[PDB]
Amino acid sequence: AQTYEITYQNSFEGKINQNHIISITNSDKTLLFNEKIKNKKADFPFEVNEINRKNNEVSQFAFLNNNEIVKTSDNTILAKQEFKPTSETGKILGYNVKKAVTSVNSNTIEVWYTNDLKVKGGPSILGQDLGLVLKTVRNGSSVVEATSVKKIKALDDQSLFNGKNITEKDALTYKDMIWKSRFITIPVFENETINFSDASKSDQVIQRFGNGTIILKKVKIPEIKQGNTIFVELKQKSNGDAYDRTGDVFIIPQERAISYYTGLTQGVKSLPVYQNGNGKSYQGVALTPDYLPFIELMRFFTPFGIGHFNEKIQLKGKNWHNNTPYRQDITELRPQLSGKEILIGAFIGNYDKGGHQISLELSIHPDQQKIVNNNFVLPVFNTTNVMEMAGQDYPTMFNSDKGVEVDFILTKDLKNAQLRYITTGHGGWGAGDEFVPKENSIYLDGKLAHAFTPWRTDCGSYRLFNPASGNFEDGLSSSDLSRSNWCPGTITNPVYINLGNLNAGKHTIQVKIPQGAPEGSSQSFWNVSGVLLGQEHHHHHHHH
Ligand SMILES: [Zn+2]
Numbered sequence: 001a002q003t004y005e006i007t008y009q010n011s012f013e014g015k016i017n018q019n020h021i022i023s024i025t026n027s028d029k030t031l032l033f034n035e036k037i038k039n040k041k042a043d044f045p046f047e048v049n050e051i052n053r054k055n056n057e058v059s060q061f062a063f064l065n066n067n068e069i070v071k072t073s074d075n076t077i078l079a080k081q082e083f084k085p086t087s088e089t090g091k092i093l094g095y096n097v098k099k100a101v102t103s104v105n106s107n108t109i110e111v112w113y114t115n116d117l118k119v120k121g122g123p124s125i126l127g128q129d130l131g132l133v134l135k136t137v138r139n140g141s142s143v144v145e146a147t148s149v150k151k152i153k154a155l156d157d158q159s160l161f162n163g164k165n166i167t168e169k170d171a172l173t174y175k176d177m178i179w180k181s182r183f184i185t186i187p188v189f190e191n192e193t194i195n196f197s198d199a200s201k202s203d204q205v206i207q208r209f210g211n212g213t214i215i216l217k218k219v220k221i222p223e224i225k226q227g228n229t230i231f232v233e234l235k236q237k238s239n240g241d242a243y244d245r246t247g248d249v250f251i252i253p254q255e256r257a258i259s260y261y262t263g264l265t266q267g268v269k270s271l272p273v274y275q276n277g278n279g280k281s282y283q284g285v286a287l288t289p290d291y292l293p294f295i296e297l298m299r300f301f302t303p304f305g306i307g308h309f310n311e312k313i314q315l316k317g318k319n320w321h322n323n324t325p326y327r328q329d330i331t332e333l334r335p336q337l338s339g340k341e342i343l344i345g346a347f348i349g350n351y352d353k354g355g356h357q358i359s360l361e362l363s364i365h366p367d368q369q370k371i372v373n374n375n376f377v378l379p380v381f382n383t384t385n386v387m388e389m390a391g392q393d394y395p396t397m398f399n400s401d402k403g404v405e406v407d408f409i410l411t412k413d414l415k416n417a418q419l420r421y422i423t424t425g426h427g428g429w430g431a432g433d434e435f436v437p438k439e440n441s442i443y444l445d446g447k448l449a450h451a452f453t454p455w456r457t458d459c460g461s462y463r464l465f466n467p468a469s470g471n472f473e474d475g476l477s478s479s480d481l482s483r484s485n486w487c488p489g490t491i492t493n494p495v496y497i498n499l500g501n502l503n504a505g506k507h508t509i510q511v512k513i514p515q516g517a518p519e520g521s522s523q524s525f526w527n528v529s530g531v532l533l534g535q536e537h538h539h540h541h542h543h544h
């Protein structure tokens, strides 16, 4: 059984493009790969195909990393190809060829093949049972043609597979593993309960605070280079709770002596007290020389009772979704995440014994983006009371004109400074700040820098995530209603407020909001966080 090696060349409309495709074949087996793979210069993931000519078993192999190979196999692929014959004949490289035509996804592919050598093969899977394919033409434009056919001693692919372990998978899993090999996933939580129960307690991996409403762990983040992108993904459903709850995925900056973790582990008294003239006290909401507030990776709101209530609440024409996905790009927080062991947590404020179930992961993608260029991150304030069920007061501070005011010191000039600002308004009645628009005003060094009214009018779009939403006499459901910058079942986007360039030295940032008046025991309040972003330039000698 003589073995042959066929080398191919790609063209577009006469223009020769390359990493040449190679087929190695004899009457028993054929191997399809390319130059870079043959030479062990191909980047992961890469694929090879092999056909067992005794039984037409087609095997696809994916090389995922230096050690891991997956394969998927199928002995029906060749039989399913449908070709139409033509009378066209000719020669390629001295071999007699016939042309046949096939159609895949509206693309037309002409295949020219020889049977002169009593072996089969080709530059792709198409036509592999017809003969040895020496030329393919895709939509009359894209051509792959053999440039040489040579005899060789044997089909020997032992070095290709040497040192690697191979595992057969189903076709869907095979593709999935190739996909996941292209980027880094950092697992955090998988099907974790977030609830309210006196029985809730920490274990050796997950710490739990707020009577079950806060789950926290330490996770190691690799070095992530400037240019890479970073996303956080959370999946949620109700395990009993009917309500639209405030949620956060957060990290805890520990660069100063005190952190939000001090509050969580010791108690709310360990947090610095903030006061602004309104007669009340607030805890851990502002940076001080000894303390940084936590950073919100993603602020989200649960829908009303998704999953748990789906079969319980039947409304004609409403087929409820099973769970809620939330995914946010957090590329700008790279400087706070890169190469650190971080404390990362999830909060859903609720009072339900069944509560909620979530999953959470981070992903890091090998990009070289040039759009988000900050190398500096400083958390300046966070009024969101993640410790709601652990003694932290609601953010009712905005009835004073002083609002939230923070002083901080920059040691180096900051170019393109921005305030990453997440705001939501609360107070759940018709004249409460959940439902009435209020202008948020941001000041830098005592001067107004930006004023805007946070408002969402798209909430009716997410109706099918919200089975337990209350239905009113006017024909609307609670989840439909326009709100101060959130909708049940969705993320609240940060805004990126341009502050210009900042000099080294002392600065102040201030937020003022005309907070609505209470109604009986009901209060309005504002969950606001601010992270300062910017680009510090570098000092450097001159060289070429
Ligand atoms: Zn083989």
Ligand SMILES: [Zn+2]
Pocket (backbone or CB within 6 Å): 540, 543
């Ligand atoms: Zn240099």
